[PDB]
From a paper:
Additionally, to obtain a co-crystal structure with substrate 1, we introduced the [name] mutation into [name] d18 ([name] d18/[name]), which abolished the protonation-initiated cyclization reaction. The asymmetric unit of the crystal structure contained two [name] molecules. Gel filtration analysis was conducted to evaluate the oligomeric state of [name] and confirmed that the major peak corresponded to the dimer. These results suggested that [name] forms a dimeric structure with a C2 symmetry axis. The obtained crystal structure of [name] represents the first experimentally determined structure of a HAD-TCβ enzyme, revealing distinct substrate-binding pockets for the HAD and TCβ domains.
In this study, we determined the co-crystal structures of drimenol synthase from [name] ([name]), which catalyzes the conversion of farnesyl pyrophosphate (1) into drimenol (2). Crystallographic analyses of the enzyme bound to substrates 1 and drimenyl monophosphate (3) demonstrated that the TCβ domain catalyzes a class II cyclization reaction initiated by protonation, whereas the HAD domain catalyzes a phosphatase-like dephosphorylation reaction dependent on a divalent metal. Our results demonstrate that [name] is a bifunctional dimeric enzyme, comprising a protonation-initiated sesquiterpene cyclase (TCβ) domain and a metal-dependent HAD domain responsible for the stepwise release of phosphate to produce compound 2.
Author numbering:
A (entry chain A): -2 to 0, 19 to 231, 234 to 536
B (entry chain B): 20 to 53, 56 to 229, 234 to 536
The structure:
């Protein structure tokens, strides 16, 4: 008998010794951390009765990979399974509503987290189910990274999903064990050198895997597109370190004209793309410091030559600039704190910090509130009680889903979620209640629009929150133009004239950040 | 080392030696005469066409608005100035009168003749409308429709495979050396066009992309469709209030879907054709060779026989030798007795339910020409109805029973291509419309219609075909699609069978 022989495990003490030997543990969700009831007769007798007929149908694979959504999958299945779609939907909702944790295995996960193991979730789940599961259960915080088929356009047991996890997370397979109930997933993982642990009803099957042989994707294309985009952006900003911009009446800036007389794009690029060459940072920083419309560490959007009559300094440009200058050691907190105090003196009747340093131009904007809050927490103002109404404004904007209508100056919903994730992730103790609702919204928006900049925002925000969004990443590659830059995009607007501002530089900087953060 | 040629008589003997001739458009068939500007930015269009972004535009990845927007940034020229220059360039193009005559003669001598050219979609649409040599090509291979461009060897392989070219007897006329160089690598002889002469290289051919995956998907699709129709030869249908039939309920009580499939997908196995033909012949909604859309069990009270089901059924049976023209002609005469006061043939056999529909008129006209009624004078107004519907672009509003514009263009293409002498004036306006619509909607059945109709008109639409491939589900079927509606209640009918049958016809016709 040449077949390897799994060591049977029947005592939690044994399980703990085995698991303690490994640096990295990979969990499945289904029937390891969760269980559910699949049988649901309804008020409708026609058709199937067991949700297992749906999840094992080939169409379910398209759902799992994010190619189709649940409405679409159920339409196809109502035909193939000769069952009214409204019954299929009812069956699926009831099954989903009946899911619970596996108490032993969630406790296992919590303990491995305490012991500072590296823990990853690798699972086939469709996108809307994943959203729901993320909100409903509370073991996600135990994971160092979450790899879900609907965000990957891959599914177990395809070898490519194991290869992508191993590469994405830099896994050393020799000290990695994989817990799953399906034998064909475990066999696929062992052939990558990962040791296996079969989760059975009353036992565990433990197979140590010496491994050692090397590992068999998109990676060559990726390196050339990254290089081509870098070269494109570096040439643009070495030639024009004052970031150019075009104005038009549509988000694609079709027929836009060169404007190039506002400092905010430059600040945005400094603030967001973390791999700029040092010489470009210096030249762009110089444009910030020497900008026309700086008055006593307050910044105006416009160069003086372009400033409309009576156009005030604004808190969005000032917050983002002060925050960048402080992070790069060009200003001290003690110089910034008096300007922050003027921001706190800029609240309106509801207590919300406003957009302009000008009592005759009252406005609020939830992204401007976010970036003001970011600066506040950065300088030590984080517990000033005068911030409470501004934070609640931001919180309700998220929870109410009002952000789906955009803000006054930023129409795209993902921009709000993106700048929010900077605050929620960089100051986690002060923003815990934002973490899950924010991550849940982002999950539901994976691949929901085609604009490269929007794609890139979702990639970066989700990855900073522990979740790998490979789908938006792939489609982001498809839209690089042949000179290596991405298309222009209108990131913000003058709302009364409906003028969009944007640049190829802005799109390309975020696209490269997204490519970098998943590398 | 090329052989320099300056004798027309020689050229004629070189060209007579080849079965297959490939033309480029630039310099070979169209040349230009280059009007200044003191505005800021570039003066010659040469800088746009050599910019890497121009390649995206030629490959059909972006349109002209998009490319001009990027180019206006990289070239620091106002996009409106780039746009004006582009347009003046394209409109100053003129035919090459010698080559157009060479091409007319080769066509009249029965050669196989192809156009292989890098041109963006909107320019091609304009040039297709502007000039009248397109009719001498057997197949037009344009980069914006292929998502390939010269001189990459992929585009030559695609052409050789797509048109089944024997390179031994093929010669390529072009004026760029790198294009000819690449063609030679495939065994194709070259004729470099200069203004004073041709350089001719004879090259010995005759020696032997995504074909692996295409085959799997075609096999998977055929297996899905064959299983569905072996199990339900009365083609099923679902109904709902939206084109995707989200929320749709099984209906399967109308015969027209079965007729559409028999009529449109030409590779069904013999046994499925027989069972489905049996459903047509046994349909109880039938009365003296007129058909009703509904089974009797579902017929609404006083619902009449209609010319759309009847025309399509009679046409299919005549074509599959189940009925004779002599039995059909008295039904055709009843259709001619069904004109409204404007002289247009109506939808229903019932003077109390007066309706017209441009697709019903098309399928009636098709039957008429098939049976020898093609010159009856009573058809004149119905034909003018269809023509005005096309030319006026009113078809973009859909017809009464078919909301999707490509459905009208697709059924028109069958008529126009199957009876080419009676519909000449339709050919170019119809091909123009279809060209501007390449890749303009996501629905698979619509993609498929544009692919099939364009190929029948001699233009290879690979853009729509590649996107078609991505929407197949893992069981081999494409998603359900609402092909027609009961307009007063706004009910869509459709099936996965219909979507799948058309998608497979599209894959087959480009194979
Ligand atoms: Cl639970
Ligand atoms: Cl959690
Ligand atoms: Cl997969
Ligand atoms: Cl500059
Ligand atoms: Cl400090
Ligand atoms: Cl406001
Ligand atoms: Cl707002
Ligand atoms: Cl904190
Ligand atoms: Cl023509
Ligand atoms: Cl190329
Ligand atoms: Cl049947
Ligand atoms: Cl006959
Ligand atoms: Cl009518
Ligand atoms: Cl109509
Ligand atoms: Cl004819």
């Amino acid at each position: 008998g040449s077949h390897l022989t799994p060591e049977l495990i029947t005592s939690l003490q044994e399980l703990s010794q085995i698991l303690d030997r490994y640096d990295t543990i990979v969990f499945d969700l289904g029937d390891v951390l969760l269980h559910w009831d699949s049988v649901h007769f309804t008020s409708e007798t026609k058709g199937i009765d067991d949700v297992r007929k749906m999840v094992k149908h080939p169409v379910w694979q398209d759902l799992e990979k994010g190619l189709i959504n649940q409405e679409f999958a159920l339409t196809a299945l109502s035909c193939e399974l000769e069952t009214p779609c409204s019954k299929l939907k009812e069956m699926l909702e009831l099954s989903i509503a009946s899911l619970q944790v596996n108490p032993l295995m969630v406790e296992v996960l919590r303990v491995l987290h305490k012991k500072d193991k590296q823990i990853y979730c690798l699972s086939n789940v469709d996108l809307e189910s994943f959203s729901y599961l993320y909100k409903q259960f509370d073991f996600w915080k135990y994971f160092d990274g979450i790899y879900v088929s609907a965000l990957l356009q891959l599914r177990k047991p395809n070898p490519d999903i194991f290869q992508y996890l191993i590469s994405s997370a830099s896994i050393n397979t020799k000290s990695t064990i994989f817990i799953d109930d399906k034998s064909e997933n475990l066999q696929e993982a062992a052939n990558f050198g990962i040791s296996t642990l079969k989760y059975n009803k009353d036992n565990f099957e433990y197979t140590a895997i010496e491994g050692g042989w090397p590992i068999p994707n998109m990676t060559p294309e990726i390196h050339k597109k990254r290089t081509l985009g870098e070269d494109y952006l570096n040439l643009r900003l070495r030639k024009f370190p004052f970031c150019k911009s075009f104005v038009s009446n549509n988000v694609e800036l079709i027929g836009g004209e060169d404007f190039s007389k506002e400092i905010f794009s430059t600040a945005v690029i400094l603030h967001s793309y973390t791999s700029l060459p040092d010489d470009i940072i210096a030249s762009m920083c110089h444009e910030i410091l020497n900008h026309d419309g700086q008055n006593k560490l307050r910044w105006c959007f416009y160069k003086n030559e372009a400033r409309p009559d009576n156009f005030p300094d604004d808190l969005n440009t000032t917050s983002m600039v002060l925050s960048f200058l402080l992070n790069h050691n060009k200003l001290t907190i003690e110089k910034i704190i008096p300007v922050a105090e003027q921001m706190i003196a800029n609240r309106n009747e509801e207590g919300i910090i406003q957009v302009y340093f000008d009592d005759n131009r009252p406005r609020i904007d939830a992204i401007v509130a976010i970036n003001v809050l970011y600066l506040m927490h950065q300088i030590g103002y984080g517990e000033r009680k005068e911030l409470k109404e501004t934070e609640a404004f931001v919180f309700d904007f998220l929870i109410s889903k009002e952000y789906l209508k955009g803000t006054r100056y930023y129409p795209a919903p993902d921009v709000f979620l993106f700048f929010l994730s900077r605050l929620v992730v960089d100051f986690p103790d002060q923003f815990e209640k934002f973490h899950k609702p924010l991550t849940e919204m982002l999950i539901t928006r994976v691949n929901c629009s085609t604009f490269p900049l929007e794609r890139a925002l979702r990639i970066i925000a989700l990855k900073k929150l522990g979740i790998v969004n490979r789908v938006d990443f792939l489609k982001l590659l498809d839209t690089q133009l042949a000179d290596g830059g991405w298309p222009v995009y209108g990131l913000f607007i003058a709302p009364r004239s409906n003028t969009y501002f944007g640049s190829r530089e802005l799109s390309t900087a975020f696209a490269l950040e997204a490519l970098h953060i998943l590398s």
